[PDB]
């Protein structure tokens, strides 16, 4: 056979992210003595739209403490923040919508966004539009907390990790139905080359293990092993179960 579409995806020739109009990487403020030992307030000057993602970004201007001037940061906006307000970052910053705090400072049960799964990644987890995590526990000795991620999984992160208090903006984006192929085309044109899909069962047997035959059927079980090679991992990868769920 020949190299299948999935294997060709990793070469990065035409499958690179279409990122000509992106406004910058969404990163939290880099850790500093001021943020470790108190609040620093920077004002969000304008909420903009990043073409790749659905969640709007915010252009937060902070004032640098080691030099005269200001530094601009691109931060994923929480649902409910507006231009012209001061947002506070640090351990001693008050808890409020949009504020960035160490995880082990806020009480349990609060909703967080722009999570930092390891102290210093300036924002790693919970970043898609409408997503949020919930802090569901703090260790007695501190230095450790438990959060529930939007996937429904519990993760233990150290208390010094930072996060924004609130919910990522542009929530419910998947609610409206994409009426036509045109909206999907325009959506993926600014993201990737993942569309259209084309069934593997409609291909020839050379380009896809599903392809071939006189009746357009898979022919062999579509649950492939986790140890399957690059050209074999094509069906339901290491599926624990199949069919409709029952809750």
């Amino acid at each position: 056979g020949r190299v299948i579409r999935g294997q060709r995806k990793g070469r990065g020739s035409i499958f690179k992210s279409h990122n000509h109009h992106r406004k910058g990487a969404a990163k939290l403020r880099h850790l500093d003595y001021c943020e470790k030992k108190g609040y620093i307030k920077g004002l969000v000057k304008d909420i903009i739209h990043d073409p790749g993602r659905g969640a709007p970004l915010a252009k937060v201007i902070f004032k640098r403490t080691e030099k005269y001037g200001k530094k601009e940061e691109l931060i994923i906006a929480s649902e409910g923040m507006f231009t012209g307000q001061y947002i506070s970052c640090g351990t001693k910053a008050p808890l409020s919508v949009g504020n960035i705090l160490p995880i082990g400072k806020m009480p349990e049960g609060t909703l967080i966004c722009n999570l930092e799964h390891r102290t210093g990644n300036r924002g790693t987890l919970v970043k898609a539009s409408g997503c949020y995590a919930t802090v569901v526990g703090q260790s007695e000795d501190g230095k450790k907390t438990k959060v529930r991620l939007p996937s429904g999984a519990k993760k233990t992160i150290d208390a010094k990790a930072r996060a924004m208090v609130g919910v990522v903006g542009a929530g419910g984006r998947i609610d409206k139905p994409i009426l036509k192929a045109g909206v999907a085309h325009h959506k993926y044109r600014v993201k990737r080359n993942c569309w259209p899909k084309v069934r593997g069962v409609a291909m020839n047997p050379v380009e896809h293990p599903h392809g071939g035959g006189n009746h357009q059927h898979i022919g062999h079980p579509s649950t492939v092993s986790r140890s399957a090679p690059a050209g074999q991992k094509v069906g339901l990868i290491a599926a624990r179960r199949t069919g409709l769920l029952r809750g």
Binding site: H49, A77, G171, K176, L179
Partner: protein, 85 residues
């Protein structure tokens, strides 16, 4: 008079797509573009500005919000719990 008895804004879609699908976007069309209320001016005139960016017709100051609503039921509850503390 009243040209569309029930279809309303979805008249731009004609007969294409499913009736239930057009009627499911009928749950959302009356509110994506609708004139909702701003909290810095006081006129029920807010309009969709982007996927998440929002603006009314008086303040000229944009606000991060829901995909097609100024506020989301999750985000009003989350804010309320935080405010309560």
């Amino acid at each position: 008079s009243r040209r569309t008895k029930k279809v309303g804004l979805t008249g731009k879609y004609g007969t294409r797509y499913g009736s239930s699908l057009r009627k499911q976007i009928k749950k959302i069309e009356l509110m994506q573009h609708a004139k909702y209320l701003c909290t810095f001016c006081g006129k029920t005139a807010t309009k969709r500005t982007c996927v998440g960016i929002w603006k009314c017709k008086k303040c000229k100051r944009k606000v991060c919000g829901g995909a097609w609503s100024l506020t989301t039921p999750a985000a009003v509850a989350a804010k309320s719990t935080i405010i309560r503390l």
